[PDB]
DNA sequence: CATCTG
DNA sequence: CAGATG
């Protein structure tokens, strides 16, 4: 956790590159297991050889561990931090809708900056254009005080469209958190569940109210159960307009809401432990349901939930307010 | 995993 | 349809 931090960090650096710049998924996966194992590893790694002793740790990595332990640096690391190509890729990637792949193509056509991008808006798709157009806004965290304003709008709008909807804003917003990255709304309806053959209007209707009142400004991706957009708290009495924020709206069969809501609410560590405990209590859980575990090894059949409460009950545990869902 | 692009 | 992105 700090006893082999650098090592794990370099490894992580190295890995990112293999994957992002080279196309080296193998090597890429290579670095990861390695960090992963050195990460658990209980002692101070004093040498490459010592490391090698571990699984995932090979000759090449043991090598790198030496030079890094030997001198505060790694040549390779040094050469890669320079390399404009590598850096251009780490950079384009920051645009929403540009991934490694697109990054590579862009750079090889010589587009390596924001300006490059603007000049060449034509070679970019809808998501990408949008992503460029709000490069700034999108990198700006979202302060909780804004979140409560967004939430308030969304909830009131869904309500008007149909009293029967059930919307919930998950994420750390939910677990307390002072600011956040984007807004994720978990949506459900009584008239939509597991078997129920669809209802697309279910989602489309909401999305539409949201734009009607101008809260949603652009669409990134709009499916029949998942919507990826851009919203904006209306600018008050003009002088201060708000940054453009990312928003996710997802439709969920009512019969599996609280499991999602539970899940989406995180934190990742929270889930894990809860999940690991579930397993103890003769259960299984995932993003959609909780299932009684047979002894034949496995076995299913969806226990029925009415709240996040039901879930806890089942695994016989302390109902935890979102706030303490930390770890 | 769900959506989009080409 | 494969393949990319979030
Ligand atoms: Na990106
Ligand atoms: Na293939």
Could you explain how this protein is built, in words?
The chain is of the alpha+beta class. It folds into 4 domains: 1-83, DNA polymerase, domain 1; 84-140, 5' to 3' exonuclease, C-terminal subdomain (DNA polymerase, domain 1, Orthogonal Bundle); 141-263, Beta Polymerase, domain 2 (2-Layer Sandwich); 264-326, 2-Layer Sandwich (Beta Polymerase, domain 3). The chain has 14 helices and 9 strands. The strands form 3 sheets. It has a 5-stranded mixed beta sheet, with helices on both faces. A two-stranded antiparallel sheet has the order 1-3. A hairpin with a 3-residue loop joins strand 5 and strand 6. Helix 10 (144-161) packs across helix 11. The relative contact order is 0.07. The protein binds sodium ion (NA) (2 copies). One sodium ion (NA) binds next to loops. The chain binds a DNA duplex (6 and 6 nucleotides) through helix 7 and strand 5.
Q: The biggest beta sheet, please? A: 5 strands, mixed
- The CATH topology label of the largest domain is Beta Polymerase, domain 2
CATH class of the largest domain: Alpha Beta
Heterogens: sodium ion
Categorize the overall geometry. globular
**Widest sheet: strand order?**
2-4-7-6-5
Percent of residues in helices comes to 40-55%
Q: State the order of secondary-structure elements, H for helix, E for strand.
A: HHHHHHHHHEHEEEHEEEHHEEH
Query: Into which percentage range does the β-strand content fall?
Result: 5-15%
């Amino acid at each position: 956790e700090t006893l082999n931090g650098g090592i794990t960090d370099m490894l992580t650096e190295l890995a990112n590159f293999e994957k992002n710049v080279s196309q080296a998924i193998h090597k890429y996966n290579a670095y990861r297991k390695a960090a992963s194992v050195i990460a658990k590893y209980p002692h101070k790694i004093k040498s490459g050889a010592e490391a090698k002793k571990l699984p995932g740790v090979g000759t090449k990595i043991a090598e790198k561990i030496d030079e890094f332990l030997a001198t505060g640096k790694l040549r390779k690391l040094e050469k890669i931090r320079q390399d404009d190509t590598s850096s251009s890729i780490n950079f384009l990637t920051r645009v929403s809708g540009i991934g490694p792949s697109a990054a590579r193509k862009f750079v090889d056509e010589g587009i390596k900056t924001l300006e490059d991008l603007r000049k060449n808006e034509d070679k970019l798709n809808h998501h990408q254009r949008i992503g460029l157009k709000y490069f700034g806004d999108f990198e700006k965290r979202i302060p909780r005080e804004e979140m409560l304003q967004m939430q308030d709008i969304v909830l009131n709008e869904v309500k008007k469209v149909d009293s029967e909807y059930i919307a919930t804003v998950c994420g750390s917003f939910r677990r307390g958190a002072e600011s956040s990255g984007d807004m994720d709304v978990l949506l459900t309806h009584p008239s939509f569940t597991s078997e129920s053959t669809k209802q697309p209007k279910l989602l489309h209707q909401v999305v539409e109210q949201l734009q009607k009142v101008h809260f949603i400004t652009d669409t990134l991706s709009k499916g029949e159960t998942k919507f990826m957009g851009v919203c904006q708290l209306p600018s008050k009495n003009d002088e201060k307009e708000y940054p453009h924020r990312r928003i996710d709206i997802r439709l969920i069969p009512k019969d599996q809401y609280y499991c999602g809501v539970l899940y989406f609410t995180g934190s990742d560590i929270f889930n894990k432990n809860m999940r690991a405990h579930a397993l103890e209590k003769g259960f299984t859980i995932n993003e959609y349901t909780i299932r009684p575990l047979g002894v034949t090894g496995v076995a299913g059949e969806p226990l029925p939930v009415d709240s996040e409460k039901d879930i806890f009950d089942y695994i016989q545990w302390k109902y935890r307010e979102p706030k303490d869902r930390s770890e």
